[PDB]
């Protein structure tokens, strides 16, 4: 062949710019093999490139890029490949070309990501030829009929114009939009870039031929743009399209927060019956009413298990545990049959147990907003009055409003510190997220005292009221009072309060997080852990995970370690499969507090998911020698398996037997029994009608649910707050509404066996076992006598039909439809669930569904 390029390299050294270029051409032809020799002589090619050149400036760049690529210095190869210009010839099946393309793409993505965060004008310029190579790759991918993943390259490079162009000028615009929204909600982290991408997405949505108003409202919820959603609704109502607006407002209530809803309602305020009932939808009157009606209609609660627990109870701890479990199993059902039957049992309570019992009443009557006030007045010392306040606040959940003035006035005119605590809790629950200045200032005044019972509630209610607001004044005041006070109970209240305050703010919470973590007060370090959780809620942020995991082993306070693990679960709830990997090792920790935190973190993360590895980890923990680790494991298992059948999870019956055994035991610890009783309550919560999921049906984080789970986890310090989990109960209902906003008798169709999503069967009394003679003894001739006596002598249906109030389990929505496409057609697939505006084409009598009385 040639066996040596030395002659070709030597041709370069000459002074003739006609010999030099032929040398370069042969050298490029042979660089496939002789890069080894050419590398030592590259410097000559370098200087030859660095001149006028006369086609040397062109070809030497490519030659040097090729030799450097072969050598291994891609950083220097890129510069010369770029300098080549038009000689790169991106369109060719060459490995050198492919590798330099990859390196250039990586360099461009890095440069764009780096310089995007910098100021608008302070940007380090990009190389125009590098941009041209990137755009050539974009256009080649487009020409290859490979529209997808050009969006991915655009996302990585942080340039939108290409993203918009490729997602528009492409086939299957709906599919590409769905893929883009999945990417924008799930994978990408940068909030500013996410908002920019979503702005582009909504612009595309609106400019589409038939705008997808539901996805537009979802993106607008993410962007926090009540003015824009209000304008969209105004246009949608000016144009004759009412079912669109109905479902838009339902989803807006189900996803957006109270502040956003209030702002959009105000914008709308700024026939009129349409606007009035739109305001009513957004306020949520019909949403809560329909949920309460759904639960009462389907209140398939089981009383024998609660009766057995009551029979087995001996101690006040287990008594309040049974009260709370009844509350959970009757939440949103307004049926207090157990409490109205066991008046002696319920009356054996004292002190804060009466507080807890009244709170249980409130949770049971959750959503029962119409007869409130007078209902509690009928239902009826200082502890009873405070419990009534707290129960009424629990009934008036995040959606409060009218009753805020009543709570404010009576908490002003409250004398007993117990009553003040209860009223502060109720007012905080009612005003959660409102950020009302008057309520906040009244709670500030109530907190500004030296009394644990009042201060704890005052601080927690301050947190609930200021939730998400990020109010600098609120943070300053709460931290100052926490530092200046002397009551650890007030400190705990303020810790949870600050955590709630700094909610939903991903990176704006980091200064406060660092301050609290570096603070020397262990309760304030716990507050820092909770602030991390609330700020990086449901984001899987690796920085926050690293902080929490570091504190779980470096800190000295077991309380702070446990809080760190709980916060870890709160962060990772969005990827349930991911958390067990973290918590398998933590669960096997010699520190019982860290073990309990691991259990509770698994519970929060896989709440209402029924994962398998989580249960596998919990079961051995359920069998531990330490007291409270067992309680945590039991409660976490209940959280995980809430609304799960034996077929769906072939261990639910095992854990039901375990709970029954631990309750019916001689030596089982008081707190283990408490945990088991709670576990039963959560497992059968809402009469098998409600599940616990921290995120909405559309993926948006559910602020009431996360707040409820956090405050419930903060029952280790205060039992009455254990009822806050009521906020975390979401009805697993698919409800069809027609144009009249009344529920018609529809027949939903689910194609699955009627045993994977059916209610657990009632188990009846265990029946009486008589005394048995033991294996009548066999004698020598007994067998002969027996011989003498011997001589002397399914369909499994594959179908499921559900009435219009349809308790459809979260996994039982993907498989759901109607028979033969009846008169009613769904506005959106029967997979998202929730409340669907069933459009109707056939006109008939259209009989409605009765509004069952609210008694159970």
């Amino acid at each position: 062949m040639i066996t040596s390029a030395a002659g070709i390299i030597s041709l370069l050294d000459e002074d003739e710019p006609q010999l030099k270029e032929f040398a370069l051409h042969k050298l490029n032809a042979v660089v496939n093999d002789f890069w080894a020799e050419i590398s030592e002589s590259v410097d000559k090619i370098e200087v030859l490139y660095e001149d006028e050149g006369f086609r040397s400036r062109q070809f030497a760049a490519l030659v040097a890029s090729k030799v450097f690529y072969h050598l291994g210095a891609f950083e220097e190869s890129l510069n010369y490949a770029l300098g080549a210009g038009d000689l790169f010839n991106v369109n060719d099946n060459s490995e050198y070309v492919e590798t330099i393309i990859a390196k250039c793409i990586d360099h461009y993505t890095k440069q764009c990501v780096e310089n995007a965060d910098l100021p608008e004008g302070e940007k380090k310029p990009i190389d125009q030829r590098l941009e041209g190579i990137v755009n050539k790759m974009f256009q080649r991918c487009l020409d290859d009929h490979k529209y997808k993943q050009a969006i991915g390259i655009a996302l990585e490079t942080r340039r939108l114009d290409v993203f918009e162009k490729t997602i528009l000028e492409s086939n299957d615009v709906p599919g590409m939009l769905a893929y883009s929204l999945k990417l924008c909600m799930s994978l990408m982290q940068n909030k500013q870039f996410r908002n920019k991408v979503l702005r582009v997405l909504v612009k595309i949505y609106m400019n589409l031929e038939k705008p997808d108003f539901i996805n537009v409202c979802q993106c607008l919820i993410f962007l926090d743009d009540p003015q824009a959603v209000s304008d969209i609704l105004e246009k949608l109502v000016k144009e004759d399209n009412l079912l669109m607006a109905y479902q838009i407002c339902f989803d807006l209530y189900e996803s957006a927060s109270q502040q956003f809803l209030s702002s959009v309602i105000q914008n709308l305020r700024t026939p009129k019956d349409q606007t009035l009932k739109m305001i009513k939808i957004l306020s949520g009157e019909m949403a809560i009413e329909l949920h309460l009606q759904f639960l009462i209609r389907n209140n398939n609660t089981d009383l024998m298990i609660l009766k057995n627990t009551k029979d087995a109870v001996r101690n006040s701890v287990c008594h309040t545990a049974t009260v709370i479990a009844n509350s959970f199993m009757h939440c949103g059902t307004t049926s207090d049959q157990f409490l109205r039957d066991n008046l002696e049992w319920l009356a054996r309570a004292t002190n804060w147990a009466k507080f807890t019992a009244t709170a249980s009443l409130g949770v049971i009557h959750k959503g029962h907003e119409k007869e409130a006030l007078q209902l509690m007045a009928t239902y009826l010392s200082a502890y009873q009055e405070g419990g009534g306040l707290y129960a009424l606040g629990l009934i008036h959940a995040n959606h409060g409003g009218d009753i805020i003035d009543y709570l404010l006035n009576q908490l002003k005119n409250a004398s007993n510190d117990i009553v003040r605590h209860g009223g502060s809790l109720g007012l905080g629950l009612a005003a959660m997220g409102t950020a009302r200045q008057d309520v906040y200032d009244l709670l500030k005044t109530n907190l500004y005292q030296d009394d644990a019972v009042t201060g704890e509630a005052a601080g927690l209610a301050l947190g609930l009221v200021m939730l998400g607001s990020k109010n600098a004044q609120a943070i300053e005041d709460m931290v100052g009072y926490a530092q200046e006070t002397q009551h650890e109970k007030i400190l705990r209240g303020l810790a949870v309060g600050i955590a709630l305050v700094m909610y939903g703010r991903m990176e704006e919470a980091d200064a406060l997080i660092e301050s609290l973590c570096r603070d020397k007060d262990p309760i304030l370090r716990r507050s820092g852990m909770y602030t991390v959780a609330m700020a990086y809620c449901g984001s899987g942020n690796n920085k926050a995970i690293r902080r929490l995991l570091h504190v779980a082993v470096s800190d000295v306070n077991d309380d702070v370690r446990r809080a760190a693990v709980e916060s870890l679960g709160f962060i990772l709830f969005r990827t349930p499969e991911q958390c067990p990997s973290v918590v398998s090792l933590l669960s096997e920790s010699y520190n019982p507090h860290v073990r309990y935190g691991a259990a509770m973190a698994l519970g929060i993360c896989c709440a209402g998911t029924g994962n398998k590895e989580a249960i596998n980890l919990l079961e051995p923990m359920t069998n531990d020698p330490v007291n409270y680790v067992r309680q945590g494991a039991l409660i976490a298992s209940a959280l995980i398996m809430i609304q799960q059948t034996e077929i769906t999870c072939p261990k639910v019956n095992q854990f039901r037997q375990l709970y029954s055994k631990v309750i019916n035991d001689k030596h089982d610890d008081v707190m283990a029994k408490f945990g088991a009783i709670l576990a039963q309550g959560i497992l059968d919560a809402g009469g098998h009608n409600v599940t616990i999921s921290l995120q909405s049906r559309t993926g948006h984080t559910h602020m009431p649910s996360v707040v409820g789970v956090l405050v419930f986890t903060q029952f280790w310090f205060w039992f009455p707050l254990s009822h806050f989990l009521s906020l975390a109960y979401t009805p697993t209902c698919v409800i069809g509404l027609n144009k009249d906003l009344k529920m018609p008798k529809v027949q939903y169709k689910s194609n699955c066996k009627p045993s994977t999503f059916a209610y657990p069967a009632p188990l009846e009394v265990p029946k009486e076992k008589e005394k048995e003679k033991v294996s009548t003894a066999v004698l020598s001739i007994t067998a002969k006598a027996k011989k003498k006596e011997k001589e002397k002598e399914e369909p499994e249906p594959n179908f499921q039909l559900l009435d219009n109030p349809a308790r459809v389990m979260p996994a039982q929505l993907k498989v759901l439809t109607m028979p033969e496409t009846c008169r009613y057609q769904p506005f959106k697939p029967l997979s998202i669930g929730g409340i669907i505006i069933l459009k109707d084409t056939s006109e008939d009598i259209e009989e409605l569904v009765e509004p069952v009385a609210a008694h159970g």
């Binding site: 997808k148 390259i153 996302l155 994978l187 690796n542 690293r546 995991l549 570091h550 470096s554 991911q578």
Partner: protein, 32 residues
């Protein structure tokens, strides 16, 4: 498809490395 898988792998790598950091620290404390 490919971009989603790539992002999944990137996140898995970050998660695994933070987990390893935690295990190193916990091992140190266990030795103490």
């Amino acid at each position: 498809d490919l971009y989603s898988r790539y992002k999944k792998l990137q996140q898995e790598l970050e998660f695994l490395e933070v987990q390893e950091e935690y295990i190193k620290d916990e091992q140190k404390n266990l030795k103490k």
